[PDB]
């Protein structure tokens, strides 16, 4: 009944829906939240070709805007499962079922957790995974960022608008972030580093975070230091629970595809961050999405 | 000496250079002409996520604009050859040589020719391969477009601003273009079709085109019809003469890569339209380019 259903309206899914709709495929785009995906949790995007800089939420709106006019059916849905029935597939959300000839899974990735004490307890009260979301709640605080990657370092740099200081704690003595971002963090006077360290415990009073205990990974030296906020950026897990059973994931839960965005199951494609891959960016999400769309068209024509 | 040299400043090459420069690789971007590549020969771009519509040359400028600020070295160069010397590579232009650790080839594709009589003779005087380039020279003419693909049909639609009428001649009875563009051409009152036909001869007086002779591919019926302009969009050839000898091309001359944009020759990557692939768009060019950039970084770090 749908030619294609796209699950997730981040940049991969929005690109795919734009393309399927231009191919006049009957297109359903399901999203649990706000179109834009991780882009909405991104303050400034510098490396999307075609924009010198642009706020994540503005790029989200620009990507969402033509979709209605092209005849994409945009709908709310949290997807809980998918059944392969041979010549059709069924998609299960909280309340609805949808039948379709093909599926493009574009549901992205989610913050990994430290799984340390205080991490859950300080939940609403000092622990965050989203700096553009929570940054202004930490005006004048000493903020701690955990991680060494693009997200830790960029979001640290963002957070310097708010904090007295921002400290990045990384578990080695060299960051993984893009060098241009490293160099910016090195030069920024409000950014400090705790190298070769991992956090062990997050501590506070009944109401909020007050300190972190951490360990040096080369010496075992243990230190406890006062901080008012902790932002955690230690990498990503796939958001693919609704396909656990289907035999299309690796051990860690990422969706495996070939270079044409095809899974095992014909008519089920995956794009963007949910895929088993190493390079997670808006550019490659958009690329994945275009590719899936064209492959889905081929698949449905040949059905 | 260069960490990476990128040959071609269309969207694939401009994305790649932006990424290598952000990785602080010493980056040379060589282009024979104007940054933008095929985008500069494109009137309206509707399917670049992030823009509802934008003129090709405007998107070109937006993609070129940050490159200088990031420290990309932009230079004129027409590349004539490349030599693999193991731990470095040398690039040969008309006058210069450049030594680099890695190469990203982003030189795109070029219009295929009909190879029919009058095609060369009417060269400057009625035959064109670029509608945004030549369209206004055909105000009030009867224009003929040859081909059935995205480029024939879009550029026909563009040309209706100028011509009394535009006729699309396709060699089958179904277009290959995206359905949304087909539907627009069907509904446009200034567009006519000659189906199941191929052009055989282009004719004119000493000074200009006056008529085309064509043949119906199912009946052999031959017809001659007056037209003032002929725009030819019958597909693409690779622009990769400078690597003919290197064993990285297929029979037709497209550069073969794996899904990480790697050729045979380590440290030589290819991206975008020059690659052996089926799906040629700005989205996948940009995706290819990002991927190559990250792979080149890995390669040069490991050298
Ligand atoms: C802080 C930060 C900064 C970044 N900055 C940049 C940058 O500057 N440049 C760059 O190129 N990349 C950047 N990235 C990476 C980039 O944002 C992602 O690569 C990209 O958004 C991936 O898009 P995607 O469409 O695959 O997934 P996502 O954007 O993750 O979209 C997934 C969507 O699927 C929806 N979804 C999930 N589960 C379900 C379900 N069960 N049912 C229905 N809907 C569901 C989610 O709500 C979401 O909207 C950044 C990432 C982060 C975290
Ligand atoms: C009429 C038309 C309309 C189009 N419309 C759309 C659209 O709306 N949306 C879409 O997604 N795609 C569209 N495309 C396809 C899109 O433009 C291409 O997919 C894309 O530009 C490919 O980019 P690329 O960087 O691989 O190659 P190109 O843009 O082809 O860039 C190649 C560059 O390499 C340079 N170069 C070549 N040889 C050499 C040399 N020997 N030395 C130095 N430099 C060299 C050339 O000057 C050129 O600038 C269109 C194509 C055409 C023809
Ligand atoms: N501008 C952009 O293009 C941009 C922006 C943001 C994100 N992204 C992309 O999005 C993807 C996710 O990025 P990411 O930064 O979230 O994740 P990431 O690349 O996985 O990096 C996570 C970082 O945290 C470190 N880490 C892990 N556990 C730790 C701990 N317990 N204590 C301290 N440090 C710890 C990792 O260490 P090791 O380095 O030792 O593994 C790594 O440096 C990546 O592909 C990234 O490039 C892109
Ligand atoms: N908006 C966009 O995204 C966009 C715009 C333009 C181009 N592109 C992409 O750029 C690439 C090139 O596009 P294209 O349109 O230039 O080439 P194309 O997809 O190769 O199509 C060429 C068309 O001309 C036909 N043809 C070939 N020889 C012919 C002849 N002698 N007489 C009449 N018709 C003839 C072909 O016929 P058959 O169909 O019988 O082969 C085909 O329909 C494609 O991947 C395309 O999708 C994208």
One DSSP character per residue, B127-183 reads EES-HHHHGGGGTTSEEEEE-SSHHHHHHHHHHTTT-SEEEEE-SSSS--S-HHHHH
Residues B230 and B241 in one domain: no
Q: Which residue of A has its CA nearest to B60?
A: A50
Are B252 and B187 within one domain? no
Element (H, E) at A198: strand A197-204
CB A296 within 8 A of CB A302: no
Tokens at B298, concatenated:
């890995």
Q: Within 13 Å, how many C-alpha atoms sit on residue B183's CB side? A: 8
For residue A300, give every residue at least 6 positions away whose Cβ sits within 8 Å of its Cβ, in sequence order, or none: A3, A4, A25, A101, A102, A267
Answer yes or no: A259 catalytic: no
How far is the C-alpha of B72 from the C-alpha of B163, rounded, in Å? 42
**Which chain A residue is nearest to residue B61, measuring alpha carbons?**
A50
Question: B138 and B185: one domain?
Answer: yes
- Final residue belonging to a domain, choices B235, B259, B294: B235
Q: Are residues B224 and B116 in the same domain?
A: yes
Nearest to A89 by CA among A253, A282, A296, A239: A296
Using an 8 Å CB-CB cutoff, list chain A residues near B51.
50, 62
Distance from CA of A209 to the nearest CA of B (A): 35
DSSP state letter for A242: G
Distance of CA A139 to the CA centre of its chain: 25
Find residue A223's DSSP bridge partners.
A214
The Cα A70–Cα A24 span in angstroms is 9
A187 close to B (CB below 8 A): no
**CA angle, A151 as apex, A145 and A152 as ends, to 5°?**
20
The reply to whether ligand 1 has any atom less than 6 angstroms from the CB of A128 is: no
The domain that holds A163 is classified in CATH as 3.50.50.60
User: Would you put residue B253 in left (φ > 0), alpha (ψ -120 to 50) or beta?
Assistant: left
| Residue of A295, A265, A296, A291 lying closest to A277 (CA atoms) | A291
3-state secondary structure of B296: helix
Q: How far apart are CA A168 and CA A157, in angstroms?
A: 10
Residue B81: strand, helix, or coil: strand
Measured between alpha carbons, how far apart are the two ends of chain A, in Å? Answer: 13
- Distance to chain A for B299, nearest Cα, Å: 15
Query: How is residue B278 annotated by DSSP?
Result: S
The verdict on A84 and A122 lying in the same domain is: no
Q: Looking at the structure, tell me whether residues B231 and B241 fall in a common domain.
A: no
Residue after which a domain boundary falls, among B199, B215, B235: B235
Q: For residue A283, give the ligand 1 atom closest to its CA.
A: 11
Q: What is the 3-state secondary structure (H, E, C) of A40-88?
A: HHCCEECCCCCCCCEEHHHHHHHHHCCCCCCCCEEEECCEEEEEECCCC
Residue B3, helix vs strand vs coil = strand
Co-location of B90 and B145 in the same domain: no
Q: Are residues B121 and B205 in the same domain?
A: yes
CA nearest neighbour of A239 among A105, A74, A65: A105
Q: Judge contact between B20 and B64, C-beta under 8 A.
A: no
A49/B contact by beta carbon, under 8 A: yes
Q: Quick one: tokens of A29?
A: 């785009």
3-state secondary structure of A136: helix
Which 8-state DSSP code applies to residue A295?
H
Token duo for residue B129: 């391969």
Q: Whole-angstrom Cα distance, residue A140 to residue A297?
A: 53
Name residues contacting ligand 4 (CB within 6 A). B 47, 114, 146-152, 154, 169-172, 176, 198, 233-236, 279-281
- Domain shared by B220 and B153, yes or no: yes
Q: Which ligand is nearest to the CA of B74?
A: 2
Q: What's the rounded Cα separation, in Å, for the pair B43 and B37? A: 13
Q: Do A116 and A231 belong to one domain? A: yes
Which atom of ligand 3 is nearest to A152's Cα? 15
Dihedral of alpha carbons B122, B127, B132, B135, sign: positive
Q: In the 8-state DSSP scheme, what is residue A112?
A: P
A133 is catalytic: yes
**B184, B209, B235 — which closes off a domain?**
B235
DSSP three-state, residue A268: strand
Q: Which residue bears the tokens 């995205």?
A: B150
Q: Which residues of B touch A181 (CB under 8 A)?
A: 22
Give the residue whose CA is nearest to atom 51 of ligand 2.
B38
Residue B271, token pair as written in the block: 């991206």
DSSP A33: S
Give the CA angle between residues A55, A56, A62 to the nearest 5°: 90
Q: What is the DSSP letter of B49?
A: T
Q: How many Cβ atoms are within 10 Å of B230's Cβ, its own excluded?
A: 26
Q: Which domain holds residue A145?
A: 112-235
Instruction: List all residues 6 or more positions away from B213 whose beta carbon is below 8 Å from its beta carbon.
Output: B199, B200, B201, B202, B203, B222, B223, B224
Nearest-CA distance B14 → chain A (Å): 8
What does the alpha-carbon distance between residue A68 and residue A61 come to, in Å, rounded to a whole number?
A: 12
Angle between helices B282-301 and B11-22 (to 10 degrees): 40
Give the whole-angstrom CA distance, residue B268 versus residue B101. Answer: 9
Q: Are B181 and B211 within one domain?
A: yes
| Structural tokens at position B276 | 């052996």
Domain count, chain B: 2
Instruction: Give the other-Cβ count within 10 Å of B62's Cβ.
Output: 17
- Are both B231 and B264 inside the same structural domain? no
Distance (Å, whole) CA A104 – CA A120: 33
Q: Is residue B126 classed as helix, strand or coil in its secondary structure?
A: coil
Q: How many residues does chain B have?
A: 303
User: Does A289 contact B at CB distance below 8 Å?
Assistant: yes
Among the atoms of ligand 3, which is closest to the Cα of residue A181? 1
Nearest CA in chain B to A14: B49
């Amino acid at each position: 009944k749908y030619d294609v259903v796209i699950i997730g309206s981040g940049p991969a899914g929005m690109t795919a829906a734009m393309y399927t709709a231009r191919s006049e495929m009957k297109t359903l785009l399901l999203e649990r939240g706000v179109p834009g995906g991780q882009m909405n949790n991104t303050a400034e995007i510098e490396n999307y070709p075609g924009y010198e800089t642009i706020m994540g939420p503005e790029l989200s709106m620009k990507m969402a805007e033509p979709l209605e006019g092209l005849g994409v059916e945009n709908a709310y849905g949290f997807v809980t499962g998918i059944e392969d029935h041979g010549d059709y597939k069924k998609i299960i959300t909280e309340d609805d079922e949808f039948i379709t000839k093909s599926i493009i899974i574009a549901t992205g990735a989610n913050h990994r957790k430290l799984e340390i004490p205080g991490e859950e307890e300080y939940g609403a009260r000092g622990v965050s995974y989203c700096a553009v979301c929570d940054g202004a709640f930490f005006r004048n605080q000493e903020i701690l960022v955990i991680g060494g990657g693009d997200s830790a370092v960029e979001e640290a740099l963002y957070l310097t608008r708010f904090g007295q200081s921002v400290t990045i704690m990384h578990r080695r003595d060299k960051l993984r972030a893009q060098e241009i971002i490293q160099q910016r963090a090195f030069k920024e006077e409000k950014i400090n580093f705790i190298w070769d360290s991992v956090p062990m415990e997050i501590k506070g009073d009944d109401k909020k975070i007050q300190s972190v205990v951490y360990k040096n990974v080369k010496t075992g030296e243990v230190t406890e230091k006062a901080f008012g906020g902790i932002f955690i950026y230690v990498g990503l897990d796939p958001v693919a629970e609704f396909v656990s059973d289907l035999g299309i994931t690796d051990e860690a839960g990422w969706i495996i595809t070939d270079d044409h965005m095809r899974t095992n199951i014909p008519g089920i494609f995956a794009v963007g961050d949910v895929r088993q891959k190493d390079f997670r960016q808006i550019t490659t999400a958009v690329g994945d999405g275009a590719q899936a769309a064209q492959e889905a068209y081929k698949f449905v024509v040949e059905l």
